[PDB]
Design the sequence.
């Protein structure tokens, strides 16, 4: 709620991409009005991102060990890991970087 | 009520998707037994939709612009818009098309 949002704002990935902030500021209202849900907030916020290590054609075994691990995460971490995985497949976001964002959120929760 | 059901059945999105029609059939009983409200009926029914335009990747601006417009809609139109936005973000349902569906429900109301 206000909780998952704070945790989101606590993320280092979030803090290094000012575009994500300008996004959360302009999206959080519709989340308060119950127009959209947290999953949507994350997709909309992380879609504005633009700065992160890139790795093309990342190996399948690593991808799968990241997903088996994400599959076992706690609520908040899972939603973030999954949203970020979108960036890994569609924008080549380095898998290790994703693994760190997940680790970090894994702790905040 | 036996008014929203009719408004729902009036939407082209509903008429062009027989799947939504079947859904409504299986879902409405729980609505009558009062386990779910109509906003829920809307979500469930639309989750069954299959036919619609898929605009992949819609710039954040367009999104926020559609949400603030949805924000000031009437009750039924707000409910219909919110359920459809789920598809927008989760299935890349065209924002234009979405706007259309929302206009039509805005009218019936």
Sequence:
């Amino acid at each position: 709620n206000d909780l998952y949002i704070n945790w989101l704002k606590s993320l280092s990935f979030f803090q290094t991409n000012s575009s994500c902030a300008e996004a959360l500021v302009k999206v959080i209202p519709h989340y308060h009005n119950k127009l959209i849900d947290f999953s949507q907030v994350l997709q909309l916020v992380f879609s504005a991102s633009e700065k992160f290590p890139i790795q093309e054609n990342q190996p399948l075994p690593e991808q799968l060990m990241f997903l088996s691990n994400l599959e076992k995460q706690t609520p908040f971490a899972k939603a973030v890991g999954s949203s970020i995985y979108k960036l890994v497949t569609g924008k080549n976001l380095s898998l290790d970087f994703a693994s760190q964002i997940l680790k970090e959120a894994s702790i905040l929760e």
DSSP finds seven helices and no strands in chain B.
